[PDB]
PDB file of C-alpha atoms and ligand atoms in Angstrom:
ATOM      1  CA  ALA A   1     117.570 251.337  20.282  1.00  0.00           C
ATOM      2  CA  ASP A   2     118.890 249.070  17.500  1.00  0.00           C
ATOM      3  CA  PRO A   3     116.002 246.848  16.301  1.00  0.00           C
ATOM      4  CA  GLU A   4     118.404 244.140  15.049  1.00  0.00           C
ATOM      5  CA  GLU A   5     119.528 243.779  18.631  1.00  0.00           C
ATOM      6  CA  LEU A   6     116.090 243.923  20.180  1.00  0.00           C
ATOM      7  CA  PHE A   7     114.378 241.610  17.710  1.00  0.00           C
ATOM      8  CA  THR A   8     115.116 238.378  15.889  1.00  0.00           C
ATOM      9  CA  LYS A   9     113.349 237.321  12.702  1.00  0.00           C
ATOM     10  CA  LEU A  10     112.298 233.665  12.529  1.00  0.00           C
ATOM     11  CA  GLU A  11     110.505 233.481   9.209  1.00  0.00           C
ATOM     12  CA  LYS A  12     109.501 235.683   6.280  1.00  0.00           C
ATOM     13  CA  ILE A  13     105.720 235.425   5.969  1.00  0.00           C
ATOM     14  CA  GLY A  14     104.920 238.246   3.551  1.00  0.00           C
ATOM     15  CA  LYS A  15     106.735 240.149   0.800  1.00  0.00           C
ATOM     16  CA  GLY A  16     106.130 243.124  -1.492  1.00  0.00           C
ATOM     17  CA  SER A  17     108.378 245.522  -3.420  1.00  0.00           C
ATOM     18  CA  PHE A  18     108.583 248.151  -0.681  1.00  0.00           C
ATOM     19  CA  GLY A  19     108.413 245.806   2.316  1.00  0.00           C
ATOM     20  CA  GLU A  20     108.497 242.437   4.058  1.00  0.00           C
ATOM     21  CA  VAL A  21     106.670 240.917   7.003  1.00  0.00           C
ATOM     22  CA  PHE A  22     108.223 238.397   9.350  1.00  0.00           C
ATOM     23  CA  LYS A  23     107.276 236.151  12.180  1.00  0.00           C
ATOM     24  CA  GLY A  24     109.735 237.143  14.897  1.00  0.00           C
ATOM     25  CA  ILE A  25     110.763 237.475  18.518  1.00  0.00           C
ATOM     26  CA  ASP A  26     111.217 240.253  21.037  1.00  0.00           C
ATOM     27  CA  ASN A  27     114.573 239.095  22.421  1.00  0.00           C
ATOM     28  CA  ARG A  28     113.992 240.612  25.864  1.00  0.00           C
ATOM     29  CA  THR A  29     110.883 238.489  26.569  1.00  0.00           C
ATOM     30  CA  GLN A  30     110.952 235.883  23.788  1.00  0.00           C
ATOM     31  CA  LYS A  31     107.456 237.051  22.794  1.00  0.00           C
ATOM     32  CA  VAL A  32     106.488 236.195  19.217  1.00  0.00           C
ATOM     33  CA  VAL A  33     105.656 239.330  17.200  1.00  0.00           C
ATOM     34  CA  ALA A  34     104.968 240.403  13.633  1.00  0.00           C
ATOM     35  CA  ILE A  35     107.756 242.546  12.196  1.00  0.00           C
ATOM     36  CA  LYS A  36     106.914 244.566   9.115  1.00  0.00           C
ATOM     37  CA  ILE A  37     109.936 246.161   7.534  1.00  0.00           C
ATOM     38  CA  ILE A  38     109.589 249.004   5.065  1.00  0.00           C
ATOM     39  CA  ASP A  39     112.431 250.035   2.779  1.00  0.00           C
ATOM     40  CA  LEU A  40     112.067 253.825   3.045  1.00  0.00           C
ATOM     41  CA  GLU A  41     114.313 254.240  -0.003  1.00  0.00           C
ATOM     42  CA  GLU A  42     111.889 252.227  -2.156  1.00  0.00           C
ATOM     43  CA  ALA A  43     108.649 253.284  -0.463  1.00  0.00           C
ATOM     44  CA  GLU A  44     107.826 256.593  -2.272  1.00  0.00           C
ATOM     45  CA  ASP A  45     104.078 257.268  -2.517  1.00  0.00           C
ATOM     46  CA  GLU A  46     102.792 254.632  -0.112  1.00  0.00           C
ATOM     47  CA  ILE A  47     104.836 256.054   2.726  1.00  0.00           C
ATOM     48  CA  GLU A  48     101.865 258.222   3.693  1.00  0.00           C
ATOM     49  CA  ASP A  49      99.777 255.041   4.134  1.00  0.00           C
ATOM     50  CA  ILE A  50     102.466 253.536   6.380  1.00  0.00           C
ATOM     51  CA  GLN A  51     102.386 256.674   8.523  1.00  0.00           C
ATOM     52  CA  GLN A  52      98.585 256.671   8.658  1.00  0.00           C
ATOM     53  CA  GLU A  53      98.408 253.018   9.728  1.00  0.00           C
ATOM     54  CA  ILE A  54     100.925 253.497  12.533  1.00  0.00           C
ATOM     55  CA  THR A  55      99.076 256.570  13.743  1.00  0.00           C
ATOM     56  CA  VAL A  56      95.678 254.864  13.777  1.00  0.00           C
ATOM     57  CA  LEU A  57      96.849 251.581  15.330  1.00  0.00           C
ATOM     58  CA  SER A  58      98.727 253.467  18.060  1.00  0.00           C
ATOM     59  CA  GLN A  59      95.379 254.980  19.027  1.00  0.00           C
ATOM     60  CA  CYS A  60      93.578 251.590  19.079  1.00  0.00           C
ATOM     61  CA  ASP A  61      93.208 249.243  22.039  1.00  0.00           C
ATOM     62  CA  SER A  62      90.816 246.421  21.211  1.00  0.00           C
ATOM     63  CA  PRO A  63      91.015 242.629  21.054  1.00  0.00           C
ATOM     64  CA  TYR A  64      89.523 242.991  17.534  1.00  0.00           C
ATOM     65  CA  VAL A  65      92.262 245.253  16.140  1.00  0.00           C
ATOM     66  CA  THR A  66      95.879 244.211  15.445  1.00  0.00           C
ATOM     67  CA  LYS A  67      98.064 245.570  18.245  1.00  0.00           C
ATOM     68  CA  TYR A  68     100.903 247.998  17.490  1.00  0.00           C
ATOM     69  CA  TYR A  69     104.030 247.736  19.680  1.00  0.00           C
ATOM     70  CA  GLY A  70     106.305 250.346  18.167  1.00  0.00           C
ATOM     71  CA  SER A  71     108.485 251.533  15.312  1.00  0.00           C
ATOM     72  CA  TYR A  72     112.242 251.449  14.915  1.00  0.00           C
ATOM     73  CA  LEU A  73     114.537 253.052  12.435  1.00  0.00           C
ATOM     74  CA  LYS A  74     117.650 251.342  11.101  1.00  0.00           C
ATOM     75  CA  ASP A  75     119.365 252.935   8.103  1.00  0.00           C
ATOM     76  CA  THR A  76     116.927 252.765   5.177  1.00  0.00           C
ATOM     77  CA  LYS A  77     114.559 250.440   7.015  1.00  0.00           C
ATOM     78  CA  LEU A  78     111.456 251.152   9.083  1.00  0.00           C
ATOM     79  CA  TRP A  79     110.684 248.294  11.493  1.00  0.00           C
ATOM     80  CA  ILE A  80     107.043 248.177  12.644  1.00  0.00           C
ATOM     81  CA  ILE A  81     106.413 245.835  15.561  1.00  0.00           C
ATOM     82  CA  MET A  82     102.894 244.329  15.669  1.00  0.00           C
ATOM     83  CA  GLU A  83     100.806 241.583  17.260  1.00  0.00           C
ATOM     84  CA  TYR A  84     101.605 238.263  15.534  1.00  0.00           C
ATOM     85  CA  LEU A  85      98.466 236.675  14.053  1.00  0.00           C
ATOM     86  CA  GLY A  86      99.358 233.201  12.801  1.00  0.00           C
ATOM     87  CA  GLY A  87      96.128 231.674  11.493  1.00  0.00           C
ATOM     88  CA  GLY A  88      96.191 233.393   8.114  1.00  0.00           C
ATOM     89  CA  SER A  89      93.767 235.886   6.569  1.00  0.00           C
ATOM     90  CA  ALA A  90      90.106 235.036   6.019  1.00  0.00           C
ATOM     91  CA  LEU A  91      90.865 235.027   2.291  1.00  0.00           C
ATOM     92  CA  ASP A  92      93.811 232.645   2.813  1.00  0.00           C
ATOM     93  CA  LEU A  93      91.504 230.327   4.732  1.00  0.00           C
ATOM     94  CA  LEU A  94      89.178 230.208   1.724  1.00  0.00           C
ATOM     95  CA  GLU A  95      91.910 228.694  -0.459  1.00  0.00           C
ATOM     96  CA  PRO A  96      91.355 225.034   0.529  1.00  0.00           C
ATOM     97  CA  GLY A  97      87.618 225.357  -0.235  1.00  0.00           C
ATOM     98  CA  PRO A  98      84.330 227.071   0.799  1.00  0.00           C
ATOM     99  CA  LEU A  99      83.393 228.089   4.348  1.00  0.00           C
ATOM    100  CA  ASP A 100      80.216 226.795   5.947  1.00  0.00           C
ATOM    101  CA  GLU A 101      77.654 229.308   7.230  1.00  0.00           C
ATOM    102  CA  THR A 102      78.728 228.679  10.812  1.00  0.00           C
ATOM    103  CA  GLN A 103      82.276 229.755   9.946  1.00  0.00           C
ATOM    104  CA  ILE A 104      80.990 232.686   7.882  1.00  0.00           C
ATOM    105  CA  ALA A 105      78.661 233.910  10.630  1.00  0.00           C
ATOM    106  CA  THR A 106      81.417 233.633  13.250  1.00  0.00           C
ATOM    107  CA  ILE A 107      83.908 235.573  11.129  1.00  0.00           C
ATOM    108  CA  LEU A 108      81.370 238.297  10.289  1.00  0.00           C
ATOM    109  CA  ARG A 109      80.407 238.575  13.948  1.00  0.00           C
ATOM    110  CA  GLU A 110      84.006 239.186  14.986  1.00  0.00           C
ATOM    111  CA  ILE A 111      84.525 241.720  12.148  1.00  0.00           C
ATOM    112  CA  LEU A 112      81.363 243.480  13.399  1.00  0.00           C
ATOM    113  CA  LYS A 113      82.812 243.720  16.919  1.00  0.00           C
ATOM    114  CA  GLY A 114      85.946 245.257  15.395  1.00  0.00           C
ATOM    115  CA  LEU A 115      83.962 247.733  13.323  1.00  0.00           C
ATOM    116  CA  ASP A 116      81.847 248.593  16.360  1.00  0.00           C
ATOM    117  CA  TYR A 117      84.998 249.349  18.291  1.00  0.00           C
ATOM    118  CA  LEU A 118      86.445 251.536  15.521  1.00  0.00           C
ATOM    119  CA  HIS A 119      83.244 253.428  14.777  1.00  0.00           C
ATOM    120  CA  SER A 120      82.798 254.220  18.470  1.00  0.00           C
ATOM    121  CA  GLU A 121      86.333 255.657  18.363  1.00  0.00           C
ATOM    122  CA  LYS A 122      85.160 257.699  15.330  1.00  0.00           C
ATOM    123  CA  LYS A 123      87.466 255.756  13.022  1.00  0.00           C
ATOM    124  CA  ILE A 124      86.537 254.316   9.620  1.00  0.00           C
ATOM    125  CA  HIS A 125      88.484 251.403   8.232  1.00  0.00           C
ATOM    126  CA  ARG A 126      87.613 252.072   4.562  1.00  0.00           C
ATOM    127  CA  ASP A 127      89.309 248.944   3.254  1.00  0.00           C
ATOM    128  CA  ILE A 128      87.248 246.108   4.744  1.00  0.00           C
ATOM    129  CA  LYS A 129      87.747 242.871   2.775  1.00  0.00           C
ATOM    130  CA  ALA A 130      88.577 239.231   3.552  1.00  0.00           C
ATOM    131  CA  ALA A 131      92.273 239.747   2.777  1.00  0.00           C
ATOM    132  CA  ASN A 132      92.407 242.321   5.603  1.00  0.00           C
ATOM    133  CA  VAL A 133      90.841 240.067   8.213  1.00  0.00           C
ATOM    134  CA  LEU A 134      93.586 238.221  10.073  1.00  0.00           C
ATOM    135  CA  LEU A 135      93.160 235.261  12.401  1.00  0.00           C
ATOM    136  CA  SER A 136      95.181 234.024  15.326  1.00  0.00           C
ATOM    137  CA  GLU A 137      95.953 230.330  15.790  1.00  0.00           C
ATOM    138  CA  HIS A 138      93.301 230.332  18.558  1.00  0.00           C
ATOM    139  CA  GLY A 139      90.688 231.385  15.995  1.00  0.00           C
ATOM    140  CA  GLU A 140      90.524 235.043  17.002  1.00  0.00           C
ATOM    141  CA  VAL A 141      89.480 237.364  14.170  1.00  0.00           C
ATOM    142  CA  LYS A 142      91.139 240.811  13.965  1.00  0.00           C
ATOM    143  CA  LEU A 143      91.271 243.760  11.592  1.00  0.00           C
ATOM    144  CA  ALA A 144      94.490 244.805   9.841  1.00  0.00           C
ATOM    145  CA  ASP A 145      95.695 247.158   7.051  1.00  0.00           C
ATOM    146  CA  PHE A 146      94.849 250.620   8.365  1.00  0.00           C
ATOM    147  CA  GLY A 147      96.736 252.393   5.587  1.00  0.00           C
ATOM    148  CA  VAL A 148      93.696 254.329   4.440  1.00  0.00           C
ATOM    149  CA  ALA A 149      91.666 254.443   7.643  1.00  0.00           C
ATOM    150  CA  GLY A 150      89.982 257.811   8.306  1.00  0.00           C
ATOM    151  CA  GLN A 151      89.394 259.855  11.446  1.00  0.00           C
ATOM    152  CA  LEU A 152      86.243 261.759  12.306  1.00  0.00           C
ATOM    153  CA  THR A 153      86.520 264.749  14.644  1.00  0.00           C
ATOM    154  CA  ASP A 154      84.805 268.103  15.208  1.00  0.00           C
ATOM    155  CA  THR A 155      87.214 270.045  12.988  1.00  0.00           C
ATOM    156  CA  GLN A 156      86.175 267.743  10.161  1.00  0.00           C
ATOM    157  CA  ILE A 157      82.664 266.371  10.238  1.00  0.00           C
ATOM    158  CA  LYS A 158      82.811 263.508   7.685  1.00  0.00           C
ATOM    159  CA  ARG A 159      85.116 262.138   5.007  1.00  0.00           C
ATOM    160  CA  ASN A 160      85.229 262.677   1.237  1.00  0.00           C
ATOM    161  CA  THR A 161      88.361 260.874   0.111  1.00  0.00           C
ATOM    162  CA  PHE A 162      88.114 258.437  -2.778  1.00  0.00           C
ATOM    163  CA  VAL A 163      89.830 255.513  -1.099  1.00  0.00           C
ATOM    164  CA  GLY A 164      89.625 251.705  -0.674  1.00  0.00           C
ATOM    165  CA  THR A 165      89.437 248.721  -3.048  1.00  0.00           C
ATOM    166  CA  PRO A 166      86.920 249.322  -5.899  1.00  0.00           C
ATOM    167  CA  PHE A 167      84.931 246.058  -5.708  1.00  0.00           C
ATOM    168  CA  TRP A 168      84.293 246.648  -1.969  1.00  0.00           C
ATOM    169  CA  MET A 169      83.739 250.416  -2.096  1.00  0.00           C
ATOM    170  CA  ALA A 170      80.427 252.004  -1.109  1.00  0.00           C
ATOM    171  CA  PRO A 171      78.602 254.012  -3.802  1.00  0.00           C
ATOM    172  CA  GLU A 172      78.830 257.196  -1.726  1.00  0.00           C
ATOM    173  CA  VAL A 173      82.607 256.702  -1.477  1.00  0.00           C
ATOM    174  CA  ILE A 174      82.833 256.298  -5.264  1.00  0.00           C
ATOM    175  CA  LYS A 175      80.844 259.510  -5.686  1.00  0.00           C
ATOM    176  CA  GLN A 176      83.026 261.222  -3.035  1.00  0.00           C
ATOM    177  CA  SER A 177      80.072 262.767  -1.230  1.00  0.00           C
ATOM    178  CA  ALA A 178      80.088 263.121   2.549  1.00  0.00           C
ATOM    179  CA  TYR A 179      80.269 259.637   4.076  1.00  0.00           C
ATOM    180  CA  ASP A 180      80.949 258.001   7.440  1.00  0.00           C
ATOM    181  CA  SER A 181      81.108 254.625   9.180  1.00  0.00           C
ATOM    182  CA  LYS A 182      78.176 253.352   7.118  1.00  0.00           C
ATOM    183  CA  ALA A 183      80.660 253.037   4.238  1.00  0.00           C
ATOM    184  CA  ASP A 184      82.334 250.207   6.187  1.00  0.00           C
ATOM    185  CA  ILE A 185      78.938 248.490   6.465  1.00  0.00           C
ATOM    186  CA  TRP A 186      78.615 248.397   2.701  1.00  0.00           C
ATOM    187  CA  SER A 187      82.151 246.992   2.451  1.00  0.00           C
ATOM    188  CA  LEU A 188      81.197 244.436   5.119  1.00  0.00           C
ATOM    189  CA  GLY A 189      78.201 243.327   3.030  1.00  0.00           C
ATOM    190  CA  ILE A 190      80.520 242.874   0.071  1.00  0.00           C
ATOM    191  CA  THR A 191      82.903 240.943   2.326  1.00  0.00           C
ATOM    192  CA  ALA A 192      79.972 238.714   3.355  1.00  0.00           C
ATOM    193  CA  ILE A 193      79.476 237.813  -0.306  1.00  0.00           C
ATOM    194  CA  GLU A 194      83.209 237.254  -0.658  1.00  0.00           C
ATOM    195  CA  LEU A 195      83.188 234.965   2.377  1.00  0.00           C
ATOM    196  CA  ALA A 196      80.298 232.966   0.879  1.00  0.00           C
ATOM    197  CA  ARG A 197      81.381 232.718  -2.739  1.00  0.00           C
ATOM    198  CA  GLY A 198      85.163 233.242  -2.628  1.00  0.00           C
ATOM    199  CA  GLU A 199      85.146 236.494  -4.616  1.00  0.00           C
ATOM    200  CA  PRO A 200      83.412 239.904  -4.576  1.00  0.00           C
ATOM    201  CA  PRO A 201      80.764 240.787  -7.196  1.00  0.00           C
ATOM    202  CA  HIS A 202      82.174 241.871 -10.598  1.00  0.00           C
ATOM    203  CA  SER A 203      85.545 240.317  -9.648  1.00  0.00           C
ATOM    204  CA  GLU A 204      86.268 239.414 -13.304  1.00  0.00           C
ATOM    205  CA  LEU A 205      85.693 243.019 -14.459  1.00  0.00           C
ATOM    206  CA  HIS A 206      88.104 245.903 -14.835  1.00  0.00           C
ATOM    207  CA  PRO A 207      88.043 248.103 -11.673  1.00  0.00           C
ATOM    208  CA  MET A 208      87.213 251.149 -13.781  1.00  0.00           C
ATOM    209  CA  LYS A 209      83.968 249.545 -14.946  1.00  0.00           C
ATOM    210  CA  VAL A 210      83.007 248.691 -11.387  1.00  0.00           C
ATOM    211  CA  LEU A 211      83.269 252.388 -10.476  1.00  0.00           C
ATOM    212  CA  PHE A 212      80.229 253.108 -12.661  1.00  0.00           C
ATOM    213  CA  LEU A 213      78.482 249.749 -12.194  1.00  0.00           C
ATOM    214  CA  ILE A 214      78.222 250.040  -8.431  1.00  0.00           C
ATOM    215  CA  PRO A 215      76.332 253.337  -8.515  1.00  0.00           C
ATOM    216  CA  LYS A 216      74.391 252.383 -11.660  1.00  0.00           C
ATOM    217  CA  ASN A 217      73.063 248.973 -10.615  1.00  0.00           C
ATOM    218  CA  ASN A 218      70.821 247.874  -7.806  1.00  0.00           C
ATOM    219  CA  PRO A 219      72.893 246.500  -4.938  1.00  0.00           C
ATOM    220  CA  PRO A 220      74.469 243.058  -5.524  1.00  0.00           C
ATOM    221  CA  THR A 221      72.612 240.078  -4.084  1.00  0.00           C
ATOM    222  CA  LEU A 222      73.946 236.800  -2.773  1.00  0.00           C
ATOM    223  CA  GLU A 223      72.873 234.074  -5.196  1.00  0.00           C
ATOM    224  CA  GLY A 224      72.735 230.300  -5.048  1.00  0.00           C
ATOM    225  CA  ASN A 225      72.805 227.817  -2.221  1.00  0.00           C
ATOM    226  CA  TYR A 226      72.955 230.151   0.746  1.00  0.00           C
ATOM    227  CA  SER A 227      70.392 230.345   3.530  1.00  0.00           C
ATOM    228  CA  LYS A 228      67.745 233.043   3.353  1.00  0.00           C
ATOM    229  CA  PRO A 229      69.034 234.768   6.506  1.00  0.00           C
ATOM    230  CA  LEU A 230      72.546 235.100   5.021  1.00  0.00           C
ATOM    231  CA  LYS A 231      71.046 236.617   1.864  1.00  0.00           C
ATOM    232  CA  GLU A 232      69.028 239.025   4.025  1.00  0.00           C
ATOM    233  CA  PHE A 233      72.185 239.892   5.995  1.00  0.00           C
ATOM    234  CA  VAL A 234      73.855 240.865   2.700  1.00  0.00           C
ATOM    235  CA  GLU A 235      70.697 242.681   1.635  1.00  0.00           C
ATOM    236  CA  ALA A 236      70.567 244.796   4.799  1.00  0.00           C
ATOM    237  CA  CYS A 237      74.246 245.791   4.473  1.00  0.00           C
ATOM    238  CA  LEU A 238      74.106 246.707   0.814  1.00  0.00           C
ATOM    239  CA  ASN A 239      71.483 249.414   0.953  1.00  0.00           C
ATOM    240  CA  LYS A 240      72.225 252.261  -1.484  1.00  0.00           C
ATOM    241  CA  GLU A 241      71.134 254.720   1.205  1.00  0.00           C
ATOM    242  CA  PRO A 242      73.592 254.858   4.144  1.00  0.00           C
ATOM    243  CA  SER A 243      70.949 256.017   6.654  1.00  0.00           C
ATOM    244  CA  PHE A 244      69.005 252.828   5.853  1.00  0.00           C
ATOM    245  CA  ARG A 245      72.060 250.623   6.485  1.00  0.00           C
ATOM    246  CA  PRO A 246      72.243 249.118   9.954  1.00  0.00           C
ATOM    247  CA  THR A 247      75.110 249.831  12.321  1.00  0.00           C
ATOM    248  CA  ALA A 248      77.661 247.130  13.148  1.00  0.00           C
ATOM    249  CA  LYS A 249      76.199 246.906  16.655  1.00  0.00           C
ATOM    250  CA  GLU A 250      72.712 246.240  15.227  1.00  0.00           C
ATOM    251  CA  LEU A 251      74.113 243.600  12.870  1.00  0.00           C
ATOM    252  CA  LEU A 252      75.484 241.730  15.881  1.00  0.00           C
ATOM    253  CA  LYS A 253      71.880 240.776  16.513  1.00  0.00           C
ATOM    254  CA  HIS A 254      70.934 239.874  12.929  1.00  0.00           C
ATOM    255  CA  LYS A 255      69.220 236.480  12.832  1.00  0.00           C
ATOM    256  CA  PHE A 256      71.842 235.077  10.481  1.00  0.00           C
ATOM    257  CA  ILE A 257      74.487 235.829  13.094  1.00  0.00           C
ATOM    258  CA  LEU A 258      72.406 234.660  16.066  1.00  0.00           C
ATOM    259  CA  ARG A 259      71.375 231.364  14.468  1.00  0.00           C
ATOM    260  CA  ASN A 260      74.768 230.454  12.986  1.00  0.00           C
ATOM    261  CA  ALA A 261      77.727 232.042  14.838  1.00  0.00           C
ATOM    262  CA  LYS A 262      79.587 229.934  17.399  1.00  0.00           C
ATOM    263  CA  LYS A 263      82.627 230.233  19.707  1.00  0.00           C
ATOM    264  CA  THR A 264      85.710 231.584  17.926  1.00  0.00           C
ATOM    265  CA  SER A 265      87.727 228.552  19.067  1.00  0.00           C
ATOM    266  CA  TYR A 266      85.769 226.419  16.587  1.00  0.00           C
ATOM    267  CA  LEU A 267      87.585 228.352  13.820  1.00  0.00           C
ATOM    268  CA  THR A 268      90.791 226.456  14.712  1.00  0.00           C
ATOM    269  CA  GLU A 269      89.566 223.603  12.546  1.00  0.00           C
ATOM    270  CA  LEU A 270      89.445 226.057   9.641  1.00  0.00           C
ATOM    271  CA  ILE A 271      93.075 226.870  10.348  1.00  0.00           C
ATOM    272  CA  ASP A 272      93.990 223.181  10.703  1.00  0.00           C
ATOM    273  CA  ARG A 273      92.424 222.662   7.298  1.00  0.00           C
ATOM    274  CA  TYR A 274      94.679 225.322   5.843  1.00  0.00           C
ATOM    275  CA  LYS A 275      97.807 223.835   7.487  1.00  0.00           C
ATOM    276  CA  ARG A 276      97.099 220.393   6.008  1.00  0.00           C
ATOM    277  CA  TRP A 277      96.214 221.938   2.665  1.00  0.00           C
ATOM    278  CA  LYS A 278      99.258 224.052   2.671  1.00  0.00           C
ATOM    279  CA  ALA A 279     101.569 221.268   3.595  1.00  0.00           C
ATOM    280  CA  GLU A 280     100.424 219.026   0.847  1.00  0.00           C
ATOM    281  CA  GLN A 281     101.028 220.279  -2.621  1.00  0.00           C
TER     282      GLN A 281
HETATM  283  C1  627 B   1     101.404 244.070   4.816  1.00  0.00           C
HETATM  284  O1  627 B   1     100.940 244.295   6.198  1.00  0.00           O
HETATM  285  C2  627 B   1     100.470 243.122   6.896  1.00  0.00           C
HETATM  286  C3  627 B   1     100.392 243.322   8.201  1.00  0.00           C
HETATM  287  O2  627 B   1     100.355 244.494   8.661  1.00  0.00           O
HETATM  288  N1  627 B   1     100.338 242.092   9.305  1.00  0.00           N
HETATM  289  C4  627 B   1     100.340 242.266  10.851  1.00  0.00           C
HETATM  290  C5  627 B   1     100.345 240.944  11.376  1.00  0.00           C
HETATM  291  N2  627 B   1     100.331 240.337  12.381  1.00  0.00           N
HETATM  292  N3  627 B   1     100.372 239.043  12.069  1.00  0.00           N
HETATM  293  C6  627 B   1     100.414 238.765  10.672  1.00  0.00           C
HETATM  294  N4  627 B   1     100.439 237.607  10.213  1.00  0.00           N
HETATM  295  C7  627 B   1     100.325 237.186   8.952  1.00  0.00           C
HETATM  296  O3  627 B   1     100.174 238.002   8.015  1.00  0.00           O
HETATM  297  C8  627 B   1     100.352 235.842   8.535  1.00  0.00           C
HETATM  298  C9  627 B   1      99.648 235.434   7.376  1.00  0.00           C
HETATM  299  C10 627 B   1      99.673 234.096   6.950  1.00  0.00           C
HETATM  300  C11 627 B   1     100.413 233.106   7.677  1.00  0.00           C
HETATM  301  N5  627 B   1     100.458 231.779   7.293  1.00  0.00           N
HETATM  302  C12 627 B   1      99.358 231.128   6.615  1.00  0.00           C
HETATM  303  C13 627 B   1      98.523 230.266   7.640  1.00  0.00           C
HETATM  304  N6  627 B   1      99.405 229.366   8.478  1.00  0.00           N
HETATM  305  C14 627 B   1      98.633 228.591   9.528  1.00  0.00           C
HETATM  306  C15 627 B   1     100.534 230.117   9.099  1.00  0.00           C
HETATM  307  C16 627 B   1     101.346 230.868   8.003  1.00  0.00           C
HETATM  308  C17 627 B   1     101.111 233.524   8.828  1.00  0.00           C
HETATM  309  C18 627 B   1     101.082 234.867   9.259  1.00  0.00           C
HETATM  310  C19 627 B   1     100.407 239.880  10.153  1.00  0.00           C
HETATM  311  C20 627 B   1     100.435 240.581   8.948  1.00  0.00           C
HETATM  312  C21 627 B   1      99.215 242.606   6.351  1.00  0.00           C
HETATM  313  C22 627 B   1      99.141 241.411   5.740  1.00  0.00           C
HETATM  314  C23 627 B   1      97.906 240.932   5.231  1.00  0.00           C
HETATM  315  C24 627 B   1      96.729 241.706   5.360  1.00  0.00           C
HETATM  316  C25 627 B   1      96.797 242.938   5.979  1.00  0.00           C
HETATM  317  C26 627 B   1      97.987 243.395   6.475  1.00  0.00           C
HETATM  318 CL1   CL B   2     104.031 243.682   2.569  1.00  0.00          CL
END
């Protein structure tokens, strides 16, 4: 029916040129939801990504993947109703200052559970990065932005498409050879660096340069004051050879994760920190 009847927006929480995201309410139940509204008139090229995300999320049912509740059409606007996640993104939560290795290990663990779910459903996220990891106010950690996610089948054996964000992209994705879920494991290893240092490797460089640097160089390493097991976690992820990369399931039992990860509810203090930080200034 009419989405402006069914839903009420409470607060604009995100904005772009083609769309806006709100905190809002299902009026029938008073449930808080995320409401992403796309101006279909302005959307042009990225409309295929919108379609792809809706399709993939409608096929997902995991506590580690942002829920999709439906789409509504009202004039030039597409309303996409989604699980509200109010803690902020992992990247957002880096703003007030660095994470400790307990927080990092917990976040990576939860991402790994999400990747394990997706890969078992023969899906590939293909844009894993801290900005795409969204937290709930309880400290749950869930995956979002499925605009370029890919589907493996029997009609098509692997993927080829040059897609993702350059600094996080696997070398085999840059080369556009046949790749699979192991590409997400590379991106996860880059995300581990990003969680530790605040930025991905080569973050000051032009994206175009990174497209030849990533295949040309040895894999990035985590440098500085970070525990050996974290550096070995990064090292295992960022193997040039995908068949030598571990799976997400295996990584759940990496010693860095086992010795450092704790209950997700402990992440609420990371969210509190952001609230206080946000409020000031
Ligand atoms: C553009 O699509 C959305 C999207 O699909 N989504 C689906 C979905 N569900 N819930 C969301 N919540 C938030 O984005 C958000 C972010 C920061 C936030 N604040 C900062 C911390 N504070 C404690 C509260 C206020 C409050 C809410 C989103 C976004 C997207 C956004 C970012 C990354 C990936 C995807
Ligand atoms: Cl947006």
